[PDB]
């Protein structure tokens, strides 16, 4: 059962945020140059309050949230977002993450209805399902949860990082790389997406990835501690050319 429940955008500065491990190869004590879809440094990221519009997916999405009450539960990814095409639904409940790809007929304004227990009010039907996956929760001071969503050659790739945050209303400064979470062999197009919130009877940020060249610094324990955006400015370009921070 669906229930029928526009402000200007706010912006924040993704200072040096949204960098993920480009592959699963171990490297240490080395500067590695790679080209991939990354969030540009110091970009203007759209700030929403958990206000739940349908957004473009473009070439991939950087999604971050700051909350202490688990309001954001999942995402809807697809094109038409109705029964005409296959759509990807990712939701997290108290014990498991449920991922399905079906011809969903989504509600005009989808959400989870929380009374402890909850009822899903996301879609009225789910026909011709092609993919299903179940595992441990993706989501489970304030908690900062960062995700990167890519869709390349039929594979929906998710990267994530979870840290404590002590800021009031913005993104933190400093470097933290996101690790691979899951790689789903789905084979569908994604052009638009929407966020699923838990509403009882928190804010998030959305940025977009670009084909950028990065210089990644791996420390002695094989983790990334810094990075240079080679197209940010003339100094960063010099640093990349000489492979030297």
């Amino acid at each position, epitope marked *: 059962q669906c229930v029928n429940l*526009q*402000l*200007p*955008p706010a912006y924040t500065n993704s200072f040096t945020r949204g960098v993920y491990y480009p592959d699963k190869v171990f490297r240490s004590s080395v500067l590695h140059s790679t080209q991939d879809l990354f969030l540009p440094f110091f970009s*203007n990221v*759209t700030w929403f309050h958990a206000d739940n*519009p*349908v*957004l*473009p*997916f*473009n*070439d991939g999405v950087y999604f971050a949230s700051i909350e202490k009450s688990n309001i954001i539960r999942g995402w809807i990814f697809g*094109t*038409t*977002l*109705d029964s*005409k095409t296959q759509s990807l639904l990712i939701v997290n409940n108290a014990t498991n993450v449920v991922i399905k790809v079906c011809e969903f007929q989504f509600c005009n304004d989808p959400f989870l209805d929380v009374y402890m227990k909850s009822e899903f009010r996301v879609y009225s039907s789910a026909n011709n399902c092609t993919f299903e996956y179940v595992s441990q929760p993706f989501l489970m001071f304030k908690n900062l949860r960062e995700f990167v969503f890519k869709n390349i050659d039929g594979y929906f790739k998710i990267y994530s990082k979870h840290t404590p945050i002590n800021l009031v209303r913005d993104l933190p400064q400093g470097f933290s790389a996101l690790e691979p979470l899951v790689d789903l062999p789905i084979g569908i197009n994604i*052009t*638009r997406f929407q966020t699923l919130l838990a509403l009882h009877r928190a804010a998030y940020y*959305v940025g*977009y990835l*670009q*084909p950028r060249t990065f210089l990644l610094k791996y420390n002695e324990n094989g983790t990334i501690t810094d990075a240079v955006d080679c197209a940010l400015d003339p100094l960063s370009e010099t640093k990349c050319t000489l492979k030297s921070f």
Partner: antibody
Amino acid sequence: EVQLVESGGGVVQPGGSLRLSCAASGFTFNSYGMHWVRQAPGKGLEWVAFIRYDGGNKYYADSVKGRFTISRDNSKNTLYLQMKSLRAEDTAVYYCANLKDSRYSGSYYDYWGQGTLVTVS
Amino acid sequence: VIWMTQSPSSLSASVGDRVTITCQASQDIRFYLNWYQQKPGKAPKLLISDASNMETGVPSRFSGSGSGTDFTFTISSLQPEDIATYYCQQYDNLPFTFGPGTKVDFK
């Protein structure tokens, strides 16, 4: 809240050039692709050009391809159209728009400006 | 290039009449058709997307359906405020195109 304002119209001579611009506000301009559409007096709508959100790929209608250039500056929330070798047949009202598109731009909302008149004579 | 056409080029109807407008494509464009309504002096307004999905704020008297190469736009009961030129647009492939436009007059 959402506005699109065209400017740079006016009267030019055949073989000349004119640079149009569109100021965007009230929405996340830097996340959306943008279109130019023109409408000659007494005629229907004609699609002119499309540019992706990152200012990367550019597409043109056959009738303007090779003469018109589409560009944007996401730091100024401004869309541009540079028209060279203008012909008498290019007389039209030019609109900037964010057209609803479930395949290419991923736009869920449809926005249009008021349009600016370009006359070639 | 996918070429679009519409029929009739113009029609006259009175208030309460049912009005149907046909849009066709030279190529199969599945369901990726937009319908616009333009009044003189104003920019076009989107009424229907994805062939049959109504835009928020659009009166329930408007509807549409179809797929492939043959689409229909319908007004179940024409109102005096519905006198406008209607255009169909395909966005299945670039370049995007608009149809000739169907002019609805007041009988």
